[PDB]
Design a binder for these strands. Structure first.
Lengths: 53, 52, 280
DNA sequence: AACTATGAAACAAATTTTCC
DNA sequence: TTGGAAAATTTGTTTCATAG
């Protein structure tokens, strides 16, 4: 039936978008952690410059 | 058999989405850990410099 | 090196930016040559305040681009372009999973350097993603940045290190033809009202070209999307006259950071550009 | 019985890599 | 060397079959 089919379309769209948003979210997380990581590291190299006076 | 070659391609393409989500999780764990240690180092050095 | 470094106290500076596109070659091909500059020339780099008389060494490696923390690209590598009839710059070729080019910085040459020994090799995606540790995909990750470094030895026994990145270079044949790209913005900001016209200068600006403004939280969760009416009638196939859209919340007290992009079709969108609205 | 979520099939659209 | 594009590979989409 034309309807039972446009519905399975959705269920598969939904199922696909869901799994994609997940990677798009794990990927957003790592990319913000990598940002905080470089900020800490730059911060450390600055404090170390000061420690050398 | 082309129909068979595409079957594997899709089989691999799906398996690939899995490994990727997994690699990103193991990655998120480690980053939170390294950032923790780094946050400490930043604090140790922070105190020291203040007392020089 | 993935560790951060910045324009040192000497200020390492990119003098002549390379060209916006440079189709890289595969190991299944022959060198497509060295990166060039929009003048027909070659990119030029220089250490500014080095009052000494000892020849330094400029390191070169291919780094990422896009909206990321700079790092060595995993899909691209510098290629020691063997030179032409008159090879201006000499090279040293080292590794560490990523090729690094060493070229002299002569005090004679005003501590300046012309890059013409640097080309770009592209590795096969399926080979890179194969290795454990990699979370990046090659699929469409085709932009790059030429990254240069110096390790300035001091009187104190110290080593002041500097680093600079060229503007992003599009290393894909197709994407060079398909994806729009901004190289210049009229303004980087304005107040909540918008309306002012922003002049974009880039590559591949057709008429399917639409510009969208977006808002994002620290989670990447988008909360605002607004299509800016960009003027289209007569201009240049690489220049857009956008009318900055009014910000959603016109009552802010702190400036807000938004993004915008030039887009064609659906899978042809430029990397996110930066904009910021200021409260009144 | 009926209906959503999901993996797998087929074939098409998108993007990369080999060839000329 | 360049530029172009056929050939090869991936990834997206619409269906089916089907567990729950």
């Amino acid at each position: 039936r034309r309807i039972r089919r446009e519905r399975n379309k959705m269920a598969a769209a939904k199922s696909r978008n869901r799994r994609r948003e997940l990677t798009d979210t794990l990927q957003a997380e790592t990319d913000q952690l990598e940002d905080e990581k470089s900020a800490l590291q730059t911060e450390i190299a600055n404090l170390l410059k000061e420690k050398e006076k | 058999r082309k129909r068979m070659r595409n079957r594997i391609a899709a089989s691999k393409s799906r398996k690939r989405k899995l490994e990727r989500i997994a690699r990103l999780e193991e990655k998120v764990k480690t980053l939170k850990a390294q950032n923790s240690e780094l946050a400490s180092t930043a604090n140790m050095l922070r105190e020291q410099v203040a007392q020089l | 090196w993935p560790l951060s470094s910045q324009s040192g106290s000497y200020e390492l500076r990119i003098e002549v930016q390379p060209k916006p596109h440079h189709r890289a070659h595969y190991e299944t091909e022959g060198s497509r040559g060295a990166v060039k500059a929009p003048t027909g020339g070659h990119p030029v780099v220089q250490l500014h305040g080095y009052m000494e008389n000892k020849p330094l060494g400029l390191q070169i490696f291919i780094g990422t681009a896009d909206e990321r923390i700079l790092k060595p690209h995993a899909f691209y590598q510098v290629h020691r372009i063997t030179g032409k009839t008159v090879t201006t710059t000499s090279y040293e070729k080292i590794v560490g999973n990523t090729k690094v080019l060493e070229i002299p910085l002569e005090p004679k040459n005003n501590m300046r350097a012309t890059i013409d020994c640097a080309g770009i090799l592209k590795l096969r995606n399926a080979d890179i993603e194969l290795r454990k540790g990699e979370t990046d995909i090659g699929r469409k990750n085709t932009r790059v940045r030429l990254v240069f470094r110096v390790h300035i030895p001091e009187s104190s026994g110290r080593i002041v290190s500097l680093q600079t990145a060229s503007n992003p270079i599009e290393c894909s044949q197709r994407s060079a033809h398909e994806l729009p790209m901004v190289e210049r913005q009229d303004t980087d900001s304005c107040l909540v009202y918008g309306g002012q016209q922003m002049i974009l200068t880039g590559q591949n600006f057709t008429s399917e070209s639409k510009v969208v403004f977006t808002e994002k939280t620290t989670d990447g969760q988008q909360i605002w999307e607004m299509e800016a009416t960009v003027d289209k009638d007569k201009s240049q196939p690489n220049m857009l006259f956008v009318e900055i859209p009014e910000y959603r919340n016109k009552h802010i007290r702190t400036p807000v950071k938004v993004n915008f992009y030039v887009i064609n079709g659906k899978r042809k969108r430029s990397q996110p550009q930066h904009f910021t609205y200021h409260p009144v």
